[PDB]
């Protein structure tokens, strides 16, 4: 209220932090910040863009819940009165960060209708489609599975459009690898959710009857209360575990994000593993499960209200499955209801598009030039196969900015293996070496032994391991073809043998 439009940006940042910690501070006093927002236009003349961006960020933080149409109409009124495109783009990015995807969709639509260039257009268009799909996902009703799967199908159509436009935006320069892979994993998660809720609905499609017709219901041969539905549950459990493995792969290949983004990816993998453990400990053998969450959980040490919300959902699902672990037989009477409730809660918590999905920093890379006999074409390299082979791998590390923004490189675990190109897949030589780059350049000698006629492929990996000690599988992973010929005297002696 009482400020003269210079310190307002600063205390807006500060109160954005404070409400980012404790959520009630925004929906407690939604109105006055909108009043300052409406007085902005004739209040400011110099840093209008900056204070507009800040106060729009905090209005999204305040309306972390569903945004009022009147309020966003007023926001659009002021933005269409006076704003830069880059400004309103930054409001849109903050909307994608907090989770106000309807407003995000509108702003992306306006920026899409202007743009100038091609990858920029496709990038804005993809962002528009994810915002629209997330709007559709937020348009969800509690305890209605048919409407939920309809909304899922609509949102999945819109991610399909978005991921197509994202692959269109992809270029050899600034390649959206993290973005495309993360949105593809989100797509696969939602497909798995749709398949799981479809099998949950088809639980009643006479699978117990098929079991009782194929074998005796008492002392079931396939399973205790056997089911093709239980087979599909096994398929879904294995698929979900593979999806969680892919999320771990995505994270360990990213390595460059800050704490918030890495934490967010960990939460998505947490959700996937939660569904896997739920379907494993409830539909499958609960006596063999015997798992109780006898550990500390529910502490408010989180860095995001989003994170707190997913964590509370996790606590709810854990307490429900721990209550329902032993109540019923494997026919899954209300087990499908518990799984559906978990799915509905996990989709009611919307999303949080994040910083490494957006502006990227501490772009570190390993060149990793091997220096064998130089194969300028793809011609394989001949070796006499009686002595040995040396490799002489080399790597130089490069940094796009101040290298130690989040993680400082400490050691480089190089990993080299062979494979029989001409078809145990030459997995004998499984070397790895932990070279420590004293300076930003390093070299290491590798020796390979092989006595096989056919061509071989040789693969190397960077395995950059940081200060506190993490795997972080990044690096080029290049391959070199190697030939293998033998002495005519050796061949003649073998023929005489």
């Amino acid at each position: 209220h009482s400020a003269q439009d210079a310190a307002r940006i600063l205390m807006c940042h500060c109160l954005a932090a404070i409400a980012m910690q404790l959520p009630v501070l925004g929906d407690g006093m939604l109105g006055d910040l909108m009043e300052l927002y409406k007085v902005i236009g004739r209040s400011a003349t110099d840093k209008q863009q900056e204070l507009l961006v800040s106060l729009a960020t905090v209005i999204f933080v305040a309306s972390q819940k569903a945004l009022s149409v009147e309020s966003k109409a007023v926001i659009k009124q002021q933005l269409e009165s006076v704003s830069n495109g880059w400004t309103v783009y930054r409001i849109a990015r903050q909307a994608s960060r907090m989770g106000n995807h309807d407003m995000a969709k509108e702003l992306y639509q306006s920026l899409l209708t202007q743009v100038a260039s091609e990858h920029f257009y496709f990038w804005l268009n993809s962002l528009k489609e994810f915002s629209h799909a997330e709007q559709c996902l937020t348009g969800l009703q509690e305890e209605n599975y048919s409407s939920a799967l309809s909304c899922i199908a609509e949102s999945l159509k819109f991610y399909h459009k978005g991921i197509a436009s994202l692959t269109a935006a992809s270029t050899p320069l600034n390649p959206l690898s993290f973005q495309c892979e993360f949105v593809k994993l989100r797509i696969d998660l939602l497909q798995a959710f749709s398949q799981l809720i479809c099998t949950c609905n088809s639980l009643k499609t006479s699978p117990p009857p098929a079991i009782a017709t194929t074998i005796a219901m008492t002392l079931g041969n396939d399973l205790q209360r056997c089911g093709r539905i239980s087979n599909q549950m096994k398929q879904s459990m294995e698929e979900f575990r593979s999806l969680a493995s892919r999320y771990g792969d995505l994270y360990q290949a990213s390595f460059d994000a800050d704490s918030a983004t890495l934490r967010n990816v960990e939460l998505q993998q947490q959700s996937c593993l939660l569904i896997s453990h739920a379907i494993e400990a409830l539909i499958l053998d609960p006596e063999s499960a015997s798992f109780q969450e006898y550990g500390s959980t529910g502490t408010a040490h989180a860095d995001s209200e989003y994170e707190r919300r997913m964590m509370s959902v996790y606590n709810h699902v854990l307490e429900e499955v721990e209550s329902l672990n032993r109540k019923y037989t494997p026919v899954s009477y209300m087990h499908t209801a518990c799984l559906c409730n978990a799915i509905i809660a996990l989709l009611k918590v919307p999303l949080s598009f994040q910083r490494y999905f957006f502006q990227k920093l501490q772009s570190t890379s390993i060149k990793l030039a091997l220096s064998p006999s130089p194969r300028n074409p793809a011609e394989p390299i001949a070796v006499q196969n009686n002595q040995q082979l040396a490799l002489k791998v080399e790597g130089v590390v490069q940094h796009g900015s101040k290298p130690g923004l989040f993680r400082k490189i400490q050691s480089v675990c190089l990993n080299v293996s062979s494979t029989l190109q001409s078809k145990i897949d030459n997995m004998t030589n499984e070397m790895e070496q932990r070279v420590e780059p004293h300076n930003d350049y390093f070299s290491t000698q590798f020796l390979l032994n092989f006595a096989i006629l056919g061509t071989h492929n040789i693969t190397v990996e960077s395995s950059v391991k940081d200060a506190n000690g993490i795997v972080w599988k990044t690096g080029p992973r290049t391959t070199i073809f190697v030939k293998s010929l033998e002495d005519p005297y050796s061949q003649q002696i073998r023929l005489q043998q």
Partner: protein
């Protein structure tokens, strides 16, 4: 005490990651067995340990015999969270051992050349400082660049003792392999073994080795 604490933390982590109730039971049995070994070996100094992790756990020991491993590791977790910090009594002017290889120098780009399968003898000359039982503890480790470790023991005539507590190791190390395409770097380091395991306490040196094939 600190090693017991380490084993306890490792047991807690494996309990966090492990689903098998019988592997949990096995790890719990082995851990409590090692605690029993500790108290049997050190009957003494239990008054010296006050408010200690180990002595409070020895007080709560029979209930651990009674109880299931799940609550055992839960109580162990909380128990070690608010266990203690022990005092470490500083002794007199003790020293830590230090090994320095003065020969070979290892800056030589001139490789050491031989023929395939034959051996080259490489002298190792090192200074050991403040080592007890040197002829039985100090062992040479050589890393061949195809990745294998060869452990060479020195004969006890190779440990000259010019003064008090400062020794010189003068020995031969026998290096051989098949032929290589180019010169490579073989690692030489001094490992210290006890009685059970080995500890590096020397700076490694790289020596250029290149075997030729047979001349005819």
């Amino acid at each position: 005490h600190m090693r017991l604490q380490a084993k306890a933390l490792q047991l807690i982590v494996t309990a966090r990651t492990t689903r098998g109730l019988d592997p949990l039971f096995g790890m719990c049995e082995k851990f409590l067995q090692e605690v029993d070994f500790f108290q049997r070996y050190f009957i003494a100094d239990l008054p010296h340990l006050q408010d200690s992790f180990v002595d409070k756990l020895l007080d709560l020991m029979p209930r651990l015999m009674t109880s299931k491993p799940a609550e055992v590791v839960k109580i162990l977790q909380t128990m070690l969270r608010q266990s203690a910090f022990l005092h470490l009594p500083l002794p007199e002017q003790i020293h830590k051992a230090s090994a320095t290889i003065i020969e070979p120098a290892g800056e030589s780009d001139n490789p050491l050349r031989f023929t395939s399968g034959l051996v080259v003898a490489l002298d190792v000359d090192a200074t050991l400082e403040h080592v007890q039982d040197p002829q039985n503890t100090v062992k040479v480790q050589v890393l061949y660049p195809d990745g294998q470790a060869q452990m060479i023991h020195p004969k006890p005539a190779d440990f000259r003792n010019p003064g008090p507590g400062r020794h010189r190791l003068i020995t031969q190390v026998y290096l051989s392999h098949t032929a290589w395409t180019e010169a490579c770097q073989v690692e030489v380091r001094l490992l210290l073994a006890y009685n059970e395991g080995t500890i590096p306490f020397s700076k490694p040196v790289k020596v250029y080795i290149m075997p030729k094939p047979a001349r005819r």
